[PDB]
Write a protein that binds this ligand. Structure first.
Ligand SMILES: [Cl-]
Ligand code: NA
Length: 129
C-alpha cells in the first residue's frame, strides 16, 4: 500500500505516535516520506548486509528476523515480512521500541538528515486529524 500523506497521518495518530516520546506527528510523517515514500512494501539492502523493511524502514540487524542477517537480535519479535503489511500496526509497535532505545528518532537516518531541524508541521498541513 502506498499511503496518502494525510491517510498516513491519521493512522499514525490513531496508534498514538503524536508526541510519542515528545515527537510531534509531523516528525513521523516526514520520516516515513523520506524512508519509504509512504510505501509499506519498501525494502532496501544496507552495506552491512542487513535490510530495512516497510513504511519506517526498520532494520533486520536488531529489530526483526529476515533469516539472512548474521547476528539478528529480533527485538520486536516479528518476521521482517510482517512490516510490509498494509496494516501498519506492527511497524508502529516496533517503532515505539526503537525511539525509546536512547537516541530517539536519530535512529532513522532520513529523519536525522532531512527532517530534524525543519518545519515538520508542514507534513500534516491540510489534514483533518
Ligand atoms: Cl528524544
Ligand atoms: Na533482528
Amino acid at each position: 500500500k502506498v499511503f496518502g500523506r494525510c491517510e498516513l497521518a491519521a493512522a499514525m495518530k490513531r496508534h498514538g505516535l503524536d508526541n510519542y516520546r515528545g515527537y510531534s506527528l509531523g516528525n513521523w510523517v516526514c520520516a516515513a516520506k523520506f524512508e519509504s515514500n509512504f510505501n509499506t512494501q519498501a525494502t532496501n539492502r544496507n552495506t552491512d548486509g542487513s535490510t530495512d523493511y516497510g513504511i519506517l524502514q526498520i532494520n533486520s540487524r536488531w529489530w526483526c528476523n529476515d533469516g539472512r542477517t548474521p547476528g539478528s537480535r529480533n527485538l520486536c519479535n516479528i518476521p521482517c515480512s510482517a512490516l510490509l503489511s498494509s496494516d501498519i500496526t506492527a511497524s508502529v509497535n516496533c517503532a515505539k521500541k526503537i525511539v525509546s532505545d536512547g537516541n530517539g528518532m536519530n535512529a532513522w537516518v532520513a529523519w536525522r538528515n532531512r527532517c530534524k531541524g525543519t518545519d515538520v508541521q508542514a507534513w500534516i498541513r491540510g489534514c483533518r486529524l
